[PDB]
Amino acid sequence: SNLIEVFVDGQSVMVEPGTTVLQACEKVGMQIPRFCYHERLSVAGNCRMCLVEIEKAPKVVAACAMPVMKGWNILTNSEKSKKAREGVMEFLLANHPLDCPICDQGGECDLQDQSMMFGSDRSRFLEGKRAVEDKNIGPLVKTIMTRCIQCTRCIRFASEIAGVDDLGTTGRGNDMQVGTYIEKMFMSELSGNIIDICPVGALTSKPYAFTARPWETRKTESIDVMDAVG
Amino acid sequence: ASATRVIQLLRNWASGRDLQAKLQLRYQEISKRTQPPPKLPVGPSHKLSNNYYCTR
Numbered sequence: 347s348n349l350i351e352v353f354v355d356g357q358s359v360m361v362e363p364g365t366t367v368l369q370a371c372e373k374v375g376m377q378i379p380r381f382c383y384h385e386r387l388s389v390a391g392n393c394r395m396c397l398v399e400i401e402k403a404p405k406v407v408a409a410c411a412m413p414v415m416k417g418w419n420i421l422t423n424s425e426k427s428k429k430a431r432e433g434v435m436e437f438l439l440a441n442h443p444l445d446c447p448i449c450d451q452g453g454e455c456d457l458q459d460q461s462m463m464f465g466s467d468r469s470r471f472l473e474g475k476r477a478v479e480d481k482n483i484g485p486l487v488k489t490i491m492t493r494c495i496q497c498t499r500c501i502r503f504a505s506e507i508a509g510v511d512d513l514g515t516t517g518r519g520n521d522m523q524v525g526t527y528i529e530k531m532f533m534s535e536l537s538g539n540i541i542d543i544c545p546v547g548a549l550t551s552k553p554y555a556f557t558a559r560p561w562e563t564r565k566t567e568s569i570d571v572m573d574a575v576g
Numbered sequence: 577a578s579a580t581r582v583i584q585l586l587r588n589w590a591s592g593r594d595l596q597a598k599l600q601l602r603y604q605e606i607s608k609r610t611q612p613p614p615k616l617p618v619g620p621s622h623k624l625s626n627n628y629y630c631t632r
Protein backbone atom coordinates (compact mmCIF):
# COMPACT_ATOMS: atom_id res chain seq x y z
CA SER A 347 0.00 0.00 0.00
CA ASN A 348 1.74 3.11 1.33
CA LEU A 349 4.72 1.17 2.72
CA ILE A 350 8.17 2.49 1.84
CA GLU A 351 11.36 0.46 1.43
CA VAL A 352 14.41 1.21 3.58
CA PHE A 353 17.57 -0.76 4.29
CA VAL A 354 19.10 -1.81 7.60
CA ASP A 355 22.72 -2.80 6.87
CA GLY A 356 21.64 -3.56 3.31
CA GLN A 357 18.63 -5.68 4.33
CA SER A 358 15.38 -4.41 2.82
CA VAL A 359 12.51 -3.54 5.18
CA MET A 360 9.01 -2.25 4.38
CA VAL A 361 7.78 0.32 6.89
CA GLU A 362 4.85 2.67 7.36
CA PRO A 363 5.43 6.41 6.79
CA GLY A 364 6.43 8.19 9.97
CA THR A 365 8.45 5.21 11.21
CA THR A 366 11.69 6.31 12.85
CA VAL A 367 15.16 4.90 12.23
CA LEU A 368 15.06 3.18 15.63
CA GLN A 369 11.79 1.38 14.84
CA ALA A 370 13.05 0.30 11.42
CA CYS A 371 16.16 -1.06 13.15
CA GLU A 372 13.93 -2.85 15.69
CA LYS A 373 11.99 -4.60 12.94
CA VAL A 374 15.03 -6.64 11.95
CA GLY A 375 15.90 -7.41 15.58
CA MET A 376 18.53 -4.70 16.13
CA GLN A 377 18.10 -2.67 19.32
CA ILE A 378 19.63 0.82 19.14
CA PRO A 379 21.28 2.05 22.37
CA ARG A 380 19.10 4.57 24.19
CA PHE A 381 18.90 6.60 27.35
CA CYS A 382 16.21 9.26 26.86
CA TYR A 383 13.88 7.48 24.42
CA HIS A 384 10.96 5.55 25.88
CA GLU A 385 8.38 4.03 23.55
CA ARG A 386 5.50 5.10 25.82
CA LEU A 387 6.72 8.69 26.33
CA SER A 388 7.16 11.74 24.14
CA VAL A 389 10.27 11.84 21.97
CA ALA A 390 12.97 13.97 23.60
CA GLY A 391 16.21 13.46 21.65
CA ASN A 392 18.58 14.90 24.26
CA CYS A 393 20.70 11.96 25.44
CA ARG A 394 22.26 11.48 21.95
CA MET A 395 23.14 7.81 22.57
CA CYS A 396 21.07 6.69 19.55
CA LEU A 397 23.17 8.43 16.88
CA VAL A 398 23.59 6.29 13.76
CA GLU A 399 25.15 6.84 10.35
CA ILE A 400 23.00 6.96 7.22
CA GLU A 401 24.85 5.77 4.13
CA LYS A 402 26.09 8.59 1.87
CA ALA A 403 25.25 11.19 4.55
CA PRO A 404 27.98 13.09 6.43
CA LYS A 405 25.99 13.79 9.62
CA VAL A 406 24.76 11.12 12.01
CA VAL A 407 21.07 11.27 12.88
CA ALA A 408 19.18 10.64 16.11
CA ALA A 409 17.51 7.30 15.40
CA CYS A 410 14.80 7.82 18.03
CA ALA A 411 13.45 11.03 16.45
CA MET A 412 14.30 10.90 12.73
CA PRO A 413 11.72 9.42 10.33
CA VAL A 414 13.16 7.05 7.74
CA MET A 415 13.20 7.99 4.06
CA LYS A 416 12.80 5.84 0.96
CA GLY A 417 16.05 4.16 -0.03
CA TRP A 418 17.92 4.98 3.18
CA ASN A 419 20.57 2.46 4.25
CA ILE A 420 20.97 2.52 8.02
CA LEU A 421 24.49 1.51 9.13
CA THR A 422 24.10 0.41 12.75
CA ASN A 423 27.60 -1.04 13.24
CA SER A 424 29.79 1.30 11.18
CA GLU A 425 32.84 3.17 12.45
CA LYS A 426 30.95 6.48 12.65
CA SER A 427 28.14 4.97 14.75
CA LYS A 428 30.53 3.25 17.15
CA LYS A 429 32.65 6.38 17.57
CA ALA A 430 29.53 8.44 18.27
CA ARG A 431 28.44 5.91 20.89
CA GLU A 432 31.85 5.93 22.57
CA GLY A 433 31.98 9.73 22.66
CA VAL A 434 28.48 10.04 24.10
CA MET A 435 29.22 7.39 26.73
CA GLU A 436 32.43 9.21 27.68
CA PHE A 437 30.52 12.47 28.12
CA LEU A 438 27.89 10.65 30.19
CA LEU A 439 30.51 9.10 32.46
CA ALA A 440 32.72 12.20 32.89
CA ASN A 441 30.75 13.56 35.86
CA HIS A 442 29.00 10.37 36.98
CA PRO A 443 29.81 9.40 40.59
CA LEU A 444 31.79 6.27 41.47
CA ASP A 445 28.82 4.85 43.33
CA CYS A 446 28.25 1.36 41.88
CA PRO A 447 29.08 -0.65 45.06
CA ILE A 448 26.65 1.50 47.10
CA CYS A 449 24.11 2.15 44.31
CA ASP A 450 20.97 0.00 44.29
CA GLN A 451 20.91 0.17 40.48
CA GLY A 452 24.09 -1.92 40.28
CA GLY A 453 23.58 -5.16 38.38
CA GLU A 454 20.51 -3.91 36.49
CA CYS A 455 21.83 -0.55 35.27
CA ASP A 456 21.37 0.60 31.69
CA LEU A 457 24.33 2.96 32.13
CA GLN A 458 26.59 0.11 33.29
CA ASP A 459 25.43 -2.31 30.60
CA GLN A 460 25.62 0.13 27.71
CA SER A 461 29.04 1.29 28.89
CA MET A 462 30.11 -2.37 28.80
CA MET A 463 28.58 -3.00 25.36
CA PHE A 464 29.17 0.27 23.46
CA GLY A 465 31.57 2.48 25.44
CA SER A 466 35.30 2.54 26.01
CA ASP A 467 36.97 0.51 28.77
CA ARG A 468 38.88 3.38 30.42
CA SER A 469 38.79 7.08 31.25
CA ARG A 470 40.83 10.13 30.27
CA PHE A 471 38.86 12.61 32.42
CA LEU A 472 41.43 14.42 34.59
CA GLU A 473 39.22 16.99 36.37
CA GLY A 474 36.97 17.10 39.40
CA LYS A 475 33.37 15.96 39.31
CA ARG A 476 30.21 17.93 39.98
CA ALA A 477 28.06 17.17 43.02
CA VAL A 478 24.44 18.27 43.41
CA GLU A 479 22.28 18.44 46.51
CA ASP A 480 19.59 15.84 47.10
CA LYS A 481 15.84 16.37 46.95
CA ASN A 482 12.93 15.10 49.06
CA ILE A 483 9.87 14.06 47.05
CA GLY A 484 8.26 11.77 49.61
CA PRO A 485 8.71 8.51 51.51
CA LEU A 486 8.43 6.30 48.41
CA VAL A 487 11.11 7.48 45.95
CA LYS A 488 14.66 7.79 47.24
CA THR A 489 16.58 10.53 45.45
CA ILE A 490 20.33 10.76 44.79
CA MET A 491 20.64 13.33 42.01
CA THR A 492 24.41 13.20 41.55
CA ARG A 493 23.66 10.03 39.55
CA CYS A 494 21.19 11.88 37.30
CA ILE A 495 22.03 11.97 33.58
CA GLN A 496 19.28 14.48 32.65
CA CYS A 497 17.31 12.20 30.32
CA THR A 498 14.07 13.89 31.53
CA ARG A 499 12.19 10.57 31.53
CA CYS A 500 10.66 11.29 34.95
CA ILE A 501 9.44 14.74 33.88
CA ARG A 502 7.81 13.38 30.73
CA PHE A 503 6.15 10.54 32.66
CA ALA A 504 4.86 12.90 35.35
CA SER A 505 3.39 15.34 32.83
CA GLU A 506 2.05 12.81 30.31
CA ILE A 507 1.15 9.60 32.17
CA ALA A 508 0.38 10.84 35.69
CA GLY A 509 -0.92 14.31 34.83
CA VAL A 510 1.24 16.00 37.48
CA ASP A 511 3.45 18.93 36.42
CA ASP A 512 5.54 19.09 39.61
CA LEU A 513 8.80 18.00 37.93
CA GLY A 514 11.08 20.14 35.81
CA THR A 515 14.59 21.45 35.23
CA THR A 516 16.14 24.48 36.92
CA GLY A 517 19.27 26.31 35.84
CA ARG A 518 21.04 25.61 32.57
CA GLY A 519 24.29 24.27 31.19
CA ASN A 520 26.27 21.91 33.38
CA ASP A 521 24.30 23.22 36.37
CA MET A 522 20.85 22.16 35.12
CA GLN A 523 19.07 20.05 37.74
CA VAL A 524 15.96 17.87 37.71
CA GLY A 525 13.57 18.52 40.58
CA THR A 526 10.69 20.58 41.93
CA TYR A 527 12.65 23.74 42.94
CA ILE A 528 10.69 23.72 46.22
CA GLU A 529 10.11 21.19 48.99
CA LYS A 530 7.14 19.33 47.52
CA MET A 531 6.22 15.65 47.55
CA PHE A 532 5.60 14.04 44.16
CA MET A 533 2.62 12.09 45.47
CA SER A 534 0.56 10.22 42.88
CA GLU A 535 -1.12 6.85 42.61
CA LEU A 536 1.46 6.06 39.88
CA SER A 537 4.51 7.85 41.32
CA GLY A 538 6.60 4.72 41.99
CA ASN A 539 6.78 4.01 38.26
CA ILE A 540 9.39 6.76 37.91
CA ILE A 541 11.75 4.38 39.72
CA ASP A 542 11.38 1.92 36.84
CA ILE A 543 11.69 4.45 34.01
CA CYS A 544 14.77 6.10 35.52
CA PRO A 545 17.70 4.38 33.77
CA VAL A 546 20.16 4.98 36.63
CA GLY A 547 20.26 4.98 40.43
CA ALA A 548 19.16 8.61 40.62
CA LEU A 549 15.64 7.47 41.56
CA THR A 550 15.26 4.30 43.62
CA SER A 551 12.77 2.53 45.86
CA LYS A 552 13.10 3.60 49.49
CA PRO A 553 11.50 0.48 51.07
CA TYR A 554 13.75 -1.69 48.86
CA ALA A 555 17.02 0.11 49.63
CA PHE A 556 20.16 -1.98 50.30
CA THR A 557 18.28 -5.28 50.63
CA ALA A 558 19.11 -7.26 47.48
CA ARG A 559 21.01 -7.47 44.21
CA PRO A 560 19.26 -8.26 40.90
CA TRP A 561 21.33 -11.39 40.15
CA GLU A 562 20.23 -12.94 43.46
CA THR A 563 16.50 -12.60 42.90
CA ARG A 564 14.18 -15.31 41.63
CA LYS A 565 11.31 -13.98 39.51
CA THR A 566 7.75 -15.30 39.68
CA GLU A 567 5.26 -13.93 37.15
CA SER A 568 1.83 -13.51 38.75
CA ILE A 569 -1.16 -11.17 39.15
CA ASP A 570 -2.02 -8.29 41.46
CA VAL A 571 -5.10 -8.46 43.70
CA MET A 572 -5.04 -4.99 45.30
CA ASP A 573 -7.82 -3.94 42.89
CA ALA A 574 -9.90 -5.39 40.05
CA VAL A 575 -7.63 -4.22 37.20
CA GLY A 576 -5.62 -7.45 37.39
CA ALA B 577 77.48 -25.54 56.64
CA SER B 578 79.11 -25.97 60.05
CA ALA B 579 80.63 -29.41 59.43
CA THR B 580 84.27 -29.97 60.35
CA ARG B 581 86.75 -30.38 57.51
CA VAL B 582 87.22 -34.10 58.21
CA ILE B 583 83.47 -34.62 57.89
CA GLN B 584 83.53 -32.56 54.68
CA LEU B 585 86.25 -34.83 53.28
CA LEU B 586 84.31 -37.94 54.30
CA ARG B 587 81.14 -36.60 52.65
CA ASN B 588 82.98 -35.68 49.45
CA TRP B 589 84.70 -39.07 49.27
CA ALA B 590 81.47 -40.97 49.92
CA SER B 591 79.42 -39.02 47.37
CA GLY B 592 82.29 -38.59 44.90
CA ARG B 593 81.70 -34.84 44.50
CA ASP B 594 82.43 -31.59 46.33
CA LEU B 595 79.25 -31.13 48.36
CA GLN B 596 80.25 -27.82 49.95
CA ALA B 597 79.99 -26.08 46.57
CA LYS B 598 76.27 -26.89 46.07
CA LEU B 599 74.43 -27.27 49.37
CA GLN B 600 70.79 -28.30 49.73
CA LEU B 601 70.30 -25.79 52.55
CA ARG B 602 70.23 -22.11 51.55
CA TYR B 603 71.97 -19.85 54.04
CA GLN B 604 72.28 -16.19 53.10
CA GLU B 605 72.27 -15.88 49.30
CA ILE B 606 68.47 -15.65 49.06
CA SER B 607 66.63 -12.34 48.71
CA LYS B 608 65.79 -10.16 51.69
CA ARG B 609 62.32 -10.67 53.12
CA THR B 610 61.82 -6.88 52.97
CA GLN B 611 61.91 -5.34 49.50
CA PRO B 612 61.61 -1.80 48.11
CA PRO B 613 58.26 -0.86 46.56
CA PRO B 614 57.75 -1.51 42.84
CA LYS B 615 56.53 0.82 40.10
CA LEU B 616 54.82 -1.52 37.59
CA PRO B 617 54.42 0.06 34.12
CA VAL B 618 50.95 0.45 32.65
CA GLY B 619 50.43 -1.00 29.18
CA PRO B 620 49.90 -0.20 25.50
CA SER B 621 46.27 1.01 25.79
CA HIS B 622 47.03 3.79 28.29
CA LYS B 623 47.21 6.57 25.68
CA LEU B 624 45.32 9.86 25.95
CA SER B 625 44.28 10.05 22.28
CA ASN B 626 44.03 7.91 19.14
CA ASN B 627 42.80 5.11 21.42
CA TYR B 628 39.23 4.32 20.38
CA TYR B 629 38.09 0.95 21.69
CA CYS B 630 36.57 -0.07 18.34
CA THR B 631 40.11 -0.25 16.91
CA ARG B 632 41.34 -2.69 19.60
Ligand code: SF4
Pocket residue numbers: 442443444445446449450451452453455456457458493545546547548
Ligand atom coordinates in the same frame (compact mmCIF):
# COMPACT_ATOMS: atom_id res chain seq x y z
S1 SF4 C 1 23.54 4.39 38.34
FE1 SF4 C 1 24.59 2.62 37.37
S2 SF4 C 1 26.62 3.45 36.73
FE2 SF4 C 1 25.75 4.95 38.22
S3 SF4 C 1 26.59 4.31 40.23
FE3 SF4 C 1 24.57 3.27 40.03
S4 SF4 C 1 25.08 1.24 39.11
FE4 SF4 C 1 26.92 2.55 38.81
Ligand code: SF4
Pocket residue numbers: 493494495496497498499500501524543544545546548549
Ligand atom coordinates in the same frame (compact mmCIF):
# COMPACT_ATOMS: atom_id res chain seq x y z
S1 SF4 D 1 16.11 11.47 37.66
FE1 SF4 D 1 16.41 9.62 36.35
S2 SF4 D 1 14.66 9.68 34.90
FE2 SF4 D 1 14.77 11.75 35.83
S3 SF4 D 1 16.07 12.95 34.38
FE3 SF4 D 1 17.48 12.11 35.96
S4 SF4 D 1 18.22 10.15 35.07
FE4 SF4 D 1 16.38 10.75 33.86
Ligand code: FES
Pocket residue numbers: 379380381382383390391392393394395396397408409410411
Ligand atom coordinates in the same frame (compact mmCIF):
# COMPACT_ATOMS: atom_id res chain seq x y z
S1 FES E 1 17.59 7.89 22.57
FE1 FES E 1 17.67 9.24 20.84
S2 FES E 1 18.67 11.04 21.61
FE2 FES E 1 18.29 9.81 23.39
Ligand SMILES: [Mg+2]
Pocket residue numbers: 451540541542543544545546547548549550
Ligand atom coordinates in the same frame (compact mmCIF):
# COMPACT_ATOMS: atom_id res chain seq x y z
MG1 LIG F 1 16.17 3.84 38.65
